[PDB]
């Protein structure tokens, strides 16, 4: 089974991803206020955290059932699934960091509240 991620899963994954990727504190500050510059440093951050939460695979791409579970807590599956899938695309520029980001970007645009609430 896949289980949901919380604030202190995120906290852990944030510090691990900052470490391995060597993310400037600069960038970390923006992430904490849900701001995301459109460059590789931010893109690979998102991939890393998604990898650790089991929401994205570098080969397979977005993991749809897990994304819906994460967001829905297995409650409002069908509605959330429809919104999640609108943001699912293929690895068009063979850049896994970009792929994960572009998904996250699509979904944060309209549904950022749900993302924050999925952690809470
Ligand atoms: C389906 C496309 C993805 C939409 C986001 C799904 C949300 C579930 C994942 C849990 C939260 C991580 C979202 C990425 C935010 C970046 C991490 C740092 C955020 C922060 O500092 O609070």
Curated annotation (Swiss-Prot):
A GO cellular-component term linked to this record: extracellular space
What does induction of this protein depend on? (Microbial infection) Up-regulated in salivary glands following dengue virus type 2 infection.
UniProt-recorded Gene Ontology molecular function terms: lipid binding; odorant binding
Q: Which Pfam families match?
A: PBP_GOBP (PF01395)
What does the UniProt entry say about where the protein is found? Secreted
- Mention one GO biological process in which this protein takes part, according to its record: sensory perception of smell
Q: Where does (9Z)-hexadecenoate bind?
A: 14, 45
Record InterPro entries: PBP/GOBP (IPR006170), PBP_GOBP_sf (IPR036728)
Where are the disulfide bridges?
A: 17-48, 44-97, 87-106
Q: Which domain of life is it from?
A: Eukaryota
Positions that bind (5Z,8Z,11Z,14Z)-eicosatetraenoate: 14
The cross-references to CDD domains, in alphabetical order and at most eight, read: PBP_GOBP
Q: Which Gene3D superfamilies match?
A: Pheromone/general odorant binding protein domain
Identify the glycosylated residues.
111
Give a brief account of the tissues where this protein occurs: High-level expression in female mouth parts, particularly in the proboscis (at protein level). Moderate-level expression in female antenna (at protein level). Expressed in testis but not in the accessory gland or ejaculatory duct (at protein level). Expressed in spermathecae (at protein level). Female salivary gland. Female chemosensory organs: antenna, palp and proboscis. Not detected in midgut.
Say where the protein is mainly found. Answer: secreted
Query: Which key words are in the record?
Result: Behavior, Disulfide bond, Glycoprotein, Secreted, Signal
Q: What happens when the protein's gene is inactivated? A: (Microbial infection) RNAi-mediated knockdown results in reduced probing propensity, measured as a percentage of mosquitoes that probed within the 400 second period. Increased probing initiation time.
Which residues make up the binding site for (9Z,12Z)-octadecadienoate?
14, 45
Under the heading SUPFAM superfamilies, the entry gives:
Insect pheromone/odorant-binding proteins
Q: What is its quaternary makeup?
A: Monomer in solution.
Report what the protein is called: Odorant-binding protein 22
Question: What organism, scientifically named, is this protein from?
Answer: Aedes aegypti (Yellowfever mosquito)
Which taxonomic lineage is given here?
A: Eukaryota, Metazoa, Ecdysozoa, Arthropoda, Hexapoda
């Amino acid at each position: 089974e896949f289980t949901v991620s919380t604030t202190e899963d995120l906290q852990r994954y944030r510090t691990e991803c900052v470490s391995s990727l060597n993310i400037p504190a600069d960038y970390v500050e923006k992430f904490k206020k849900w701001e995301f510059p459109e460059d590789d440093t931010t893109m690979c951050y998102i991939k890393c955290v998604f990898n650790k939460m089991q929401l994205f695979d570098d080969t397979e791409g977005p993991l749809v059932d897990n994304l819906v579970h994460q967001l829905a807590h297995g409650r409002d599956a069908e509605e959330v699934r429809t919104e999640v899938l609108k943001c699912v695309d293929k690895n068009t520029d063979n850049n896994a960091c970009h792929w994960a980001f572009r998904g996250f970007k699509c979904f944060q645009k309209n549904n950022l509240s749900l993302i924050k609430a999925s952690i809470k």
